[PDB]
Design an enzyme around this catalytic site. Structure first.
Site, mmCIF file in Angstrom:
data_model
loop_
_atom_site.group_PDB
_atom_site.id
_atom_site.type_symbol
_atom_site.label_atom_id
_atom_site.label_comp_id
_atom_site.label_asym_id
_atom_site.label_seq_id
_atom_site.Cartn_x
_atom_site.Cartn_y
_atom_site.Cartn_z
ATOM 1 C CD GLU A 35 2.069 -16.060 43.257
ATOM 2 O OE1 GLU A 35 3.150 -15.506 43.547
ATOM 3 O OE2 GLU A 35 1.174 -15.480 42.606
ATOM 4 C CG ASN A 46 7.891 -7.348 44.873
ATOM 5 O OD1 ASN A 46 7.808 -8.073 43.873
ATOM 6 N ND2 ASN A 46 7.317 -7.658 46.024
ATOM 7 C CG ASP A 49 6.143 -2.521 46.064
ATOM 8 O OD1 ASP A 49 7.003 -3.303 46.490
ATOM 9 O OD2 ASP A 49 5.018 -2.916 45.732
ATOM 10 C CB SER A 51 6.451 -4.967 49.311
ATOM 11 O OG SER A 51 6.163 -5.370 47.985
ATOM 12 C CG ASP A 53 5.680 -10.978 46.834
ATOM 13 O OD1 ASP A 53 4.868 -10.303 47.484
ATOM 14 O OD2 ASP A 53 5.951 -10.751 45.650
ATOM 15 C CG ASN A 60 3.316 -7.489 49.189
ATOM 16 O OD1 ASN A 60 3.083 -6.427 49.749
ATOM 17 N ND2 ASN A 60 4.286 -7.631 48.303
#
Length: 130
Positions: A35, A46, A49, A51, A53, A60
């Protein structure tokens, strides 16, 4: 902060992650590795959408932390996403515990399915004294 492997392994054990909701320390290590590369300031937008991380566990902004600019967002973990960019990972750990408290568990992270699930993950935590 970019953690060294064993230093992170010991920190996670101290924080009560070993066996949390049936998840071995080696699995949490495999997750952090893929990750963020054990990097606490890692961020990933991202475009799809809208959002983002955040942090070592790439948590998220739509469901777990609040960053104000994510559409259709909620705050399950009830944290500011800013807290997930600290060198001290106490808040990131608390958030990660919250995420796996849902029925999907560790599967919430697609990266875990691709790179950790059904594999030999001993290597991630082997030789660290935990």
């Amino acid at each position: 902060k970019v953690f060294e492997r064993c230093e992170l392994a010991r920190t996670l054990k101290r924080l009560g992650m070993d066996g949390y909701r049936g998840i071995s320390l080696a699995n949490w290590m495999c997750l952090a590795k893929w990750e963020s590369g054990y990097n606490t300031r890692a961020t990933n937008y991202n475009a799809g959408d809208r959002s983002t991380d955040y942090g070592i566990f790439q948590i998220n902004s739509r469901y777990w932390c609040n960053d104000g600019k994510t559409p259709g967002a909620v705050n399950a973990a009830h944290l500011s996403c800013s807290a997930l960019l600290q060198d001290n990972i106490a808040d990131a750990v608390a958030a990660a515990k919250r995420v796996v408290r849902d029925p999907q568990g560790i599967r919430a992270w697609v990266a875990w399915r691709n790179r950790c699930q059904n594999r030999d993950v001993r290597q991630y935590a082997q030789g660290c004294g935990v």
